[PDB]
Curated annotation (Swiss-Prot), chains B, C:
Inactivates the type B streptogramin antibiotics by linearizing the lactone ring at the ester linkage, generating a free phenylglycine carboxylate and converting the threonyl moiety into 2-amino-butenoic acid. This is Virginiamycin B lyase. The gene is vgb. Has unequivocally been shown to cleave the ester bond of streptogramin B antibiotics by an elimination reaction and not by hydrolysis, therefore is a lyase and not a hydrolase. The olefinic dehydrobutyrine thus generated in the N-terminal position has a Z stereochemistry. Disulfide bonds: none annotated. The lineage of its organism: Bacteria, Bacillati, Bacillota, Bacilli, Bacillales. Mg(2+) binds at E267, E283.
Length: 7, 293, 293, 7
């Protein structure tokens, strides 16, 4: 949920 | 102690993600759903910068030395730029689908950025020449990028479990994080001149010196899932805890305090510091500020 | 035209930054890493002056009228002095850490200097009384300082985008540079009696008269990032181009010529002129001289 | 890189 999966 | 106030945005589409402040208290946010960049004036007024083409997925941004807002377009394979005159320039990358993400200024003024699918550090000049440097290892998934006290650029390698170092001549050097498959994300220069970073998986705040010495400090809340880290006053290091819905602070003696945001499921992302106020972006349509008093 | 010779130092630790010549061809350099001041004798031998305490960050220096080398200690909050008997005197500033930088001689012999964090022009006498004058604007970040034809001291205001003027009575006067946020650095008295200066961001050579009239000349190389400026022969004005790795020269008709160094990434800093040779310090462990052929 | 950031 932090943009790139999973940042 | 401190105090937590959340500013609600009027655009509700938008997805506030990367945040930065300027040579006044002008805060700039990237909004990856709205496909635009907004600025909140010192006292009140928002001004949005709608991108020409849709689906760019605006991620990280930074304010350059010559008064420009630089940003990456994760899905458009582009580097963006808002000039002092308010116009938007976009620069396409050499290779298709490089997926630019992190962005910061280099010691000479050049803008450096990371390419996740591209697996290479980037480099761009105002007049818009680009040169890249391939990483040694396959699928390092480079993310955030920061300028260290040794004037080399320091970057986290999400998949490769490392902190990378790149100097001006493209010489790349990697330091393997003791915590296996910790998946580092945020990196920033601390006021002690070491590079501080977060471990989304390991659940740790990491410190790496310019020499390469690594020390780790465990985040009290389990599964906190930290995203972005910024330096505050003195030795302070603030970080957004995306999974725990909290704001973490590494204070004196390397102790971690955690301040609950607790409007629920807010998704804290990018974070910075203007000198008095810790500013952080929450993907769920609001902007958080945190002052001591 | 001209010719470019770089002398390599034997101390490698060192970081040569500020340079000056004497009433012989004696060149003195500040070395901020070595924490010392060296002198290169007319033909051959260096003589180092090691500071008593470590971490002073020796920046600018100048040779006073009575045969003394005066210098600032950026990180030690001090003003330094080498007497003609070779002994080092150090003078602590009234306010903790004030961060002194630029330095030049006043019309009466007094030594004037700028305090960056301090935000005030300084003043020191041989017997070591100090008096300061607070700047009007918050965080002007004053840098270089030079003595103008009107016998007032002229200084650049890096943050405040201005050229400042201070007379003997502490009367301060400021002139806003047309180029917004240009971040001026080097200032010097030109042989036409106007004050000439560099714009690290604007990428321009600036000229201000004593009356206050400003004219600007664009540097041909983009992002040149100029640091220090000195007056040469006739109307010549030489300047170190830190970011472009070149030496710039404003000649006849206000034309800028640019001579490449071509030792890569050398970091040219301080610059001066002994009558025949343009001397300039390169932070990357060498000293550059440039003569007409 | 010019001593004080960024002179
Ligand atoms: C064109 C871009 N510019 C200029 C416009 C910037 C590159 S640079 O100027 O920032 C740079 C950073 C530090 N470098 C040093 O020599 C240095 C950094 O810390 C120190 N020296 C301190 C020391 O005390 C010296 C000692 O430790 C020496 C070390 C660690 C030397 C390391 C090896 N240095 C190099 O090989 C230089 C490598 C690259 C080219 C660096 C940098 C650019 C990062 O060299 C420098 O120009 C400079
Ligand atoms: C830390 C995250 N966790 C775990 C702790 C929670 C689950 S989530 O947060 O990741 C979730 C996924 C997408 N959500 C959006 O808001 C979202 C997704 O697409 C969009 N918004 C885009 C849109 O704006 C429009 C879209 O068509 C429909 C929307 C936005 C509907 C929004 C209404 N959502 C809710 O009522 C609830 C939103 C939160 C509660 C949701 C949960 C209901 C799953 O989770 C979100 O935070 C997140
Ligand atoms: Mg999300
Ligand atoms: Mg620019
Ligand atoms: Mg004297
Ligand atoms: Mg330097």
């Amino acid at each position: 949920x932090t943009x790139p999966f999973x940042x | 102690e401190f105090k937590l106030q959340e500013l609600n945005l009027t655009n509700q589409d938008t997805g506030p993600y990367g945040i930065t402040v300027s040579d006044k208290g002008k805060v700039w946010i990237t909004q990856h759903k709205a496909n635009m960049i907004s600025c909140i004036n010192l006292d009140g007024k928002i001004t949005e910068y709608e991108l020409p083409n849709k689906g760019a997925k605006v991620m990280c941004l930074t304010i350059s030395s010559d008064g420009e807002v630089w940003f990456t377009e994760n899905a458009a394979n582009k580097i963006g730029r808002i000039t002092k005159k308010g116009i938007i320039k976009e620069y396409t990358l050499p290779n298709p689908d490089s997926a630019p993400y992190g962005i910061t200024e280099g010691p000479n003024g050049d803008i450096w950025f990371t390419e996740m699918n591209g697996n290479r550090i980037g480099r761009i000049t105002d007049d818009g020449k680009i040169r890249e440097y391939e990483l040694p290892n396959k699928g390092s998934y480079p993310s955030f990028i920061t300028l260290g006290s040794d004037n080399a650029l320091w970057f986290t390698e999400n998949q490769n479990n490392a902190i990378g170092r790149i100097t001006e001549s493209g010489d790349i050097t990697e330091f393997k994080i003791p915590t296996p498959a910790s998946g580092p994300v945020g990196i920033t220069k601390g006021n002690d001149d070491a590079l501080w970073f977060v471990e989304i998986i390991g659940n740790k705040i990491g410190r790496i010196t310019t020499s390469g010495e690594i020390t780790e400090f465990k985040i009290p809340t389990p599964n906190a899932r930290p995203h972005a880290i910024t330096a505050g006053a003195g030795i302070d290091l603030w970080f957004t805890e995306w999974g725990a819905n909290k704001i973490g602070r590494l204070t004196s003696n390397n102790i971690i305090e955690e301040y609950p945001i607790q409007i629920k499921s807010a998704e804290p992302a990018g974070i910075c510091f203007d000198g008095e106020t810790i500013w952080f972006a929450m993907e769920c349509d609001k902007i958080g500020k945190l002052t001591l008093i």
